[PDB]
Design a binder for this molecule. Sequence first.
Ligand SMILES: COc1cc(Cl)cc(C(=O)Nc2ccc(Cl)cn2)c1NC(=O)c1scc(Cc2nccn2C)c1Cl
Ligand SMILES: [Ca+2]
Ligand SMILES: [Ca+2]
Lengths: 51, 233
Amino acid sequence: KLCSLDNGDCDQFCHEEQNSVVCSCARGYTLADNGKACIPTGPYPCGKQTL
Amino acid sequence: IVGGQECKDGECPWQALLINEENEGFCGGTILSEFYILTAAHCLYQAKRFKVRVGDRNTEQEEGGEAVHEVEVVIKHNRFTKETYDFDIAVLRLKTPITFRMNVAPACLPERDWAESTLMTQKTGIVSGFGRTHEKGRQSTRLKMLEVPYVDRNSCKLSSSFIITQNMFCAGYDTKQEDACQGDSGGPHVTRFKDTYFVTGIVSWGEGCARKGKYGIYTKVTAFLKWIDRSMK
Ligand SMILES: COc1cc(Cl)cc(C(=O)Nc2ccc(Cl)cn2)c1NC(=O)c1scc(Cc2nccn2C)c1Cl
Ligand SMILES: [Ca+2]
Ligand SMILES: [Ca+2]
């Protein structure tokens, strides 16, 4: 199922390559050490409500 | 926005409002970045000279977050025509950068394949704006948001008196009195995924507002991601 299985466990973008999941992030985020989570690089990252 | 509810503090920070010389909003937009606003191409024909306001939730009261920005460049899609409303998309570059803060922040642009596979197959997206609260009513002084179901593409084409092009998609309700409306045009349709909001549409057109058997029609942003990227350079 890969990316079709719960987004491949990715926080954001999921791509399938060589029958493996590859995660990536929107501009302004960096992929975390686990290769799945997306970490904001600076203040007021895109797509986050300001609460 | 017909139905729905108010955007509460911080909830719709990517909303922009296009305002005319009279300081009246006539269309919405979406903050993409400090310099760029996404809006509808057809909105550009509805005012001579306009500016962009961000950080506003109540047009009758100064909340402390409001900022007005002048437009430096208008980038309208060269394939837009008023007869079809196809390619209903434009990008605005601002003269000065938006300073993000409470109630002022960009929505994320998704990647195409993932957005179409994963975001546009979600149950709902969210539309927002200062537009009319019913088809015959006046514009809202309060920024509103509305959860709108993605609508089956076949069902929509069958429902529509006008051609639904590959650059449009439909969202909303068959009979439930909730929908975007005039004044919301050009504004955000976003989809939430794991607490992050991605731009998925532009409020484009609809036969009236919240009419039985009619849906809201949105510009399919995922079809224009390369075009948007180029325009922001
Ligand atoms: C009578 O005019 C209106 C009056 C009101 Cl109060 C509202 C609207 C409108 O655009 N409504 C609306 C509702 C939901 C969404 Cl997502 C967008 N727009 C409209 N618009 C319309 O009905 C229509 S019908 C077809 C169009 C666009 C068009 N012109 C030639 C070809 N096409 C597709 C519009 Cl705009
Ligand atoms: Ca205000
Ligand atoms: Ca309807």
